Amino acid sequence: GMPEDLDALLDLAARHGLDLDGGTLRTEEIGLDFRVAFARAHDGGDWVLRLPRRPDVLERAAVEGRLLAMLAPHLDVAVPDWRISTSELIAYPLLPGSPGLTVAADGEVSWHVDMASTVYARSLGSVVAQLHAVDAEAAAATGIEVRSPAQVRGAWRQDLARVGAEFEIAPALRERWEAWLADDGCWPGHSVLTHGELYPAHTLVEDERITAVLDWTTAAVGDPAKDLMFHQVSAPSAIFEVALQAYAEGGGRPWPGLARHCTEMFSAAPLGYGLYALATGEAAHREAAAAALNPP
Numbered sequence: 001g002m003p004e005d006l007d008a009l010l011d012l013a014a015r016h017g018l019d020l021d022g023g024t025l026r027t028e029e030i031g032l033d034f035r036v037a038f039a040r041a042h043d044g045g046d047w048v049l050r051l052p053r054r055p056d057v058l059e060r061a062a063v064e065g066r067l068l069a070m071l072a073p074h075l076d077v078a079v080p081d082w083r084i085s086t087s088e089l090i091a092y093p094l095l096p097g098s099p100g101l102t103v104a105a106d107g108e109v110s111w112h113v114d115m116a117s118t119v120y121a122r123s124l125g126s127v128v129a130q131l132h133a134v135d136a137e138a139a140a141a142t143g144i145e146v147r148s149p150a151q152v153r154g155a156w157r158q159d160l161a162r163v164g165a166e167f168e169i170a171p172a173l174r175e176r177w178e179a180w181l182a183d184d185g186c187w188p189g190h191s192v193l194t195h196g197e198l199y200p201a202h203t204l205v206e207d208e209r210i211t212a213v214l215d216w217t218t219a220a221v222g223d224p225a226k227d228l229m230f231h232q233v234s235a236p237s238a239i240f241e242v243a244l245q246a247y248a249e250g251g252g253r254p255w256p257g258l259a260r261h262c263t264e265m266f267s268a269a270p271l272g273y274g275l276y277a278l279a280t281g282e283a284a285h286r287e288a289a290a291a292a293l294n295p296p
């Protein structure tokens with residue numbers, strides 16, 4: 001859709017050297033931190049605009065920029081190349097391929113790639129191995145969050161306590177999550193650079209192969225499984241094994257309990273809803289988290 005502040009946005013982009021055809025500028029997605037728009041330049045190039053919605057987003061954006069600068073040479077998929085990156089505007093050339101899925105504003109999901117795909121599984125395992133191979137000290141120097149295996153497991157234990165102090169949690173869910181936290185077989189023995197929100201909305205594809213990976217704000221050194229989780233819970237087990245095999249062939253070090261860890265981690269999504277509601281303070285979020293934490 002045509003932005004209501006179209007006028008100011010063209011001025012903003014031109015002040016940064018980007019001469020856009022204002023007819024082409026349309027808002028694609030309004031995130032919690034960035035408004036994202038597509039636009040074409042008069043020289044024909046296609047562009048993505050990231051517009052920070054509040055000044056408190058800027059120091060995280062600066063870390064992500066540092067991350068992306070060190071990361072890009074290490075991966076055989078494209079990542080956003082922030083040719084403009086200021087306090088007022090980030091912009092990068094539009095990356096090729098189609099999002100594997102798209103989540104509308106009304107929450108409905110449109111799928112472009114099917115999770116039974118062996119080609120997609122192999123591609124995902126390969127890209128995640130390459131990311132996981134990135135030197136974690138070099139990644140930590142960008143400013144991203146860093147957790148050892150003990151701190152990964154400690155953070156989940158702390159989150160269960162913080163959420164349980166503010167919400168009623170169904171006893172069967174608490175017992176499942178306590179059993180998960182207690183089970184050494186589930187937990188990683190090493191930390192790696194991770195994407196942190198790796199699912200098909202952020203993997204562009206062509207012919208079921210990943211061409212680019214978007215949206216690196218959540219990148220951190222931490223649990224390898226978090227970048228395989230969405231595939232584990234959405235793909236048939238035999239297709240997740242194709243991704244695990246590609247991961248291992250690329251140098252990844254999966255552990256036997258990893259698939260189960262992914263499914264226990266996904267069952268704990270309500271903890272994330274509770275943490276999000278505690279951060280926003282909004283009534284609708286609190287009520288959504290409350291319902292998810294104590295299901296019928």
Ligand SMILES: CC[C@H]1OC(=O)[C@H](C)[C@@H](O[C@H]2C[C@@](C)(OC)[C@@H](O)[C@H](C)O2)[C@H](C)[C@@H](O[C@@H]2O[C@H](C)C[C@H](N(C)C)[C@H]2O)[C@](C)(O)C[C@@H](C)CN(C)[C@H](C)[C@@H](O)[C@]1(C)O
Pocket residue numbers: 001023024025026038039040046047094096097098099102112
């Ligand atoms: C660079 C600025 C332009 O933005 C683009 O070019 C996008 C990257 C482009 O996308 C590019 C890139 C690519 C690979 O799609 C991602 C290509 O297939 C299409 C034809 O053009 C979009 C996503 C197209 O694409 C369709 O939007 C769907 C959400 C997905 C669908 N797909 C799954 C079949 C795809 O056809 C679409 C048909 O142009 C959307 C249509 C409603 C018109 N847009 C509002 C305007 C006019 C755009 O021209 C633009 C904003 O000015």
Ligand SMILES: CC[C@H]1OC(=O)[C@H](C)[C@@H](O[C@H]2C[C@@](C)(OC)[C@@H](O)[C@H](C)O2)[C@H](C)[C@@H](O[C@@H]2O[C@H](C)C[C@H](N(C)C)[C@H]2O)[C@](C)(O)C[C@@H](C)CN(C)[C@H](C)[C@@H](O)[C@]1(C)O
Pocket residue numbers: 072073074075076077078096206209210211
């Ligand atoms: C459209 C479908 C295809 O997708 C593409 O073509 C991508 C956009 C392509 O990228 C395109 C487009 C372009 C401009 O790179 C962005 C071109 O230089 C290369 C040769 O092909 C990737 C990103 C190239 O990998 C990139 O190679 C650059 C030289 C460096 C870059 N990174 C290290 C900074 C790295 O991610 C690569 C060399 O293809 C990776 C290689 C290991 C795997 N390919 C062989 C696969 C099978 C692809 O053919 C594909 C998935 O079927």
Ligand SMILES: Nc1nc2c(ncn2[C@@H]2O[C@H](COP(=O)(O)OP(=O)(O)O)[C@@H](O)[C@H]2O)c(=O)[nH]1
Pocket residue numbers: 028029030031032033034035036048093094095096097098099102201202204214215
């Ligand atoms: N085709 C294409 N889509 C993109 C690109 N960058 C972002 N998008 C789309 O815009 C959405 C929002 O971008 P994202 O970086 O995730 O920003 P967020 O709103 O902060 O989550 C993505 O999920 C994709 O649908 C790109 O380079 N190419």
Ligand SMILES: [Cl-]
Pocket residue numbers: 035053
């Ligand atoms: Cl906004």
Ligand SMILES: [Cl-]
Pocket residue numbers: 147152221222223226
């Ligand atoms: Cl983590």
Ligand SMILES: [Mg+2]
Pocket residue numbers: 202215
């Ligand atoms: Mg995103």
